[PDB]
Design a binder for this molecule. Structure first.
Ligand code: NA
Ligand code: NA
Lengths: 398, 397
């Protein structure tokens, strides 16, 4: 029997970091960038009018007096695809965002002119560069758009699109395969007969894997002789950083599946000094030693084991810096018993007392265990009783 | 010009609550359940061994060796009858033989295969999961209004429900309009600009909790644009269109939008993002946000008005973002009478754990890069100087 601390050390030390992948930028939302992204295109990609007015050479509208009419030879709107070159002493009507004519260096505001349609007279001077959004004003080639290690949010995705990057290298979510094993199991579209039970765990643990941040594939029930089970597990090893199997621990009924797991890797089935969920296992499969969690058939115990050991492996594989959960001290509302020598993890309801802002916790047979829990009372190994009014550690299930 | 409060009030009241949908239970994770789900069968449907051992009558082991007359594994579908003073080996989960009432654990016996000696007694019912121990008919597995987490998904599977009625995420269509726009896999020619906003606003819609379809660039004459918008109305609770306010470039799309509903383009007393619009399209009055081409302003408008509508469509009551007080690090300018939303970087001072904020508002590259917050400047405040304590909207990732 190992402690919770020793088991957590084993599984976390074995965690496999997924290899970076290059993906379309929209699919990178919430993922950590795995490369430094430099802009290859300027933003804006061309000099633009910053206001409605007339693209000119500043010197032709008094732009160098601080050191009369001009022909209007074109009109440019946003999206214009035709090249336009400004000759000396010429003006081109421009709308905000329009591509500036070549050889212009300023925009005379509409309000600073007589608004002439064929010939325009400047009523006030503009200096060179004024009211122009120059090419590369916001971003130049070589500028760092996204740094390695940054989480890609909506603004970063917008930045990638603004510099013409359609794909980006990211650290992907760890891939998890969830498998249920047992001759008693039937899927939820079937009618269980004598000796048959619905496959609860593949659905609940796949959901817990998604909430933890993994890229989860629910295989469901793996049925057949051990060689067929081995075939199934091997196929999941090709596509997984984490494998979770229920029904592989418990007794003689899983001797065959454990035999096949021993042919695929190093399997450890030493118990953990915890409750519920003392009976569990952990293996490293294949040449890359992929973590394989062996969980029991009990759905409540499996969820507790998943939260205690699988979720931290998911979080570190994601590049997260807080692996564990927040732990708060709360006042017990009801009586709880615990095994002497085993750490207790009691699914509970954590609340704030309106009259004192103090945290209160209520401990919550399958219906009660699978009910609405936002906390787990963490009972030390040597503690055997919790009474109302006792202050206890509560793991907050955010 | 209307205030931020007035515009937020307008869009919130127009939010469309999605109709419930029946979906596969795995796809219901994190959604609110829209129906009461009752168990129809007792769980388990049969007495099963809770451990490896010997199914017996407790009285026969002192609750004297017993002959072992069979072995039952998990998944056995045939009934088996235990005679007096007999034992049958059982695996965990195996159906208990009829007329047995307890399981003697393997470790509490001499492990005999033909005759078994109990080392200590077990009482009636011990190590047995009786029929209906887990769930009884009529038991409420999931209540209407409960959020479906992993445990509730497990409960739905335990009562044999493959599908469940839920309140779905609001469907949002994101559309970009403008003759200058090209998609990001193209090489922009003369006058062409990458379509930034459809990507950034679709991503913001997903983070807000919407079911987002990014239509991308809607191109063509106004009648074709109307055709596109009408198709998006069939599948949306929210529509977001950029490039429909700004100038002459959007005259066509505003014309067809006015044919589909009542469009309001009154400016909002805010900066950035004063230029915007809002309409309700078709007989189902689908909210339609008209956002500008400026990507920073569009993200600010989305955060300020679209995100609350998403959260309102989800039925959430908790405030939008957390607001923390922080010490200003640099100077910020604001117009009197307009609410400021300045993208900023919020940090904690190591020497005192106090919150500090640095305003990032060229500035677009920095503003969209290292930003985790927005300084919220009141209408009557015209300047923030270093050392000022200000409200910072925390943009949690
Ligand atoms: Na204990
Ligand atoms: Na102000």
């Amino acid at each position: 029997m190992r402690s919770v601390e020793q088991q957590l050390s084993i599984v976390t030390e074995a965690a496999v970091a997924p290899e970076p992948v290059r993906i379309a930028i929209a699919e990178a939302l919430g993922l950590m960038c795995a490369e430094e992204v430099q802009a290859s295109r300027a933003l804006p990609g061309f000099a633009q009018a910053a206001i409605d007015g007339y693209a000119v050479r500043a010197v032709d509208v008094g732009g160098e007096k601080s050191l009369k009419s001009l022909p209007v030879v074109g009109e440019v709107a946003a999206g214009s695809q035709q090249p336009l070159r400004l000759q000396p002493k010429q003006a081109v009507m421009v709308h905000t965002g329009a591509p500036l004519p070549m050889l212009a260096d300023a925009v005379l505001p509409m309000a600073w002119s007589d608004r002439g349609r064929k010939r325009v007279t400047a009523q006030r001077p503009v200096r060179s560069g004024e009211f122009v959004r120059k090419e590369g004003d916001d971003i130049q080639p070589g500028d760092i758009a996204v740094s390695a290690g940054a989480v890609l949010g909506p603004a970063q995705i917008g930045l990638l699109a603004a510099v013409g990057r359609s794909k980006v290298l990211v650290y992907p979510r760890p891939r998890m395969s969830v498998i249920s094993v047992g001759a008693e199991l039937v899927d939820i579209d079937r009618q269980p007969g004598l000796g048959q039970v619905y496959d609860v765990n593949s659905y609940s643990l796949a959901a817990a894997g998604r909430e933890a941040g993994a890229d989860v594939y629910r295989y469901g029930i793996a049925a057949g002789e051990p060689r067929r089970i081995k075939e199934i597990i091997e196929s999941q090893m090709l596509r997984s950083e984490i494998i979770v199997i229920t029904g592989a621990v418990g007794g003689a009924g899983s001797a065959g599946v454990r035999q096949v797991l021993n042919e695929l890797g190093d399997i450890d089935t030493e118990r953990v000094a915890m409750h519920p969920g003392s009976v569990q296992g952990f293996g490293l499969l294949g040449e890359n030693k992929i973590p394989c969690f062996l969980l029991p058939s009990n759905p409540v115990a499996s969820l507790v084991i998943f939260e205690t050991f699988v979720r931290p492996v998911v979080r570190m594989s994601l590049g997260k810096s807080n692996a564990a959960r927040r732990v708060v001290r709360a006042r017990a509302l009801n009586h709880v018993v615990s095994v002497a020598g085993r750490k207790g993890f009691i699914r509970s309801r954590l609340m704030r007392d309106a009259e004192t802002q103090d945290y209160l916790v209520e401990a919550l047979h399958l219906l009660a265990g699978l009910s609405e829990a936002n906390g787990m009372i963490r009972i030390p190994e040597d503690v055997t009783e919790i009474r109302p009014g006792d202050v206890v550690d509560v793991i907050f299930l955010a």
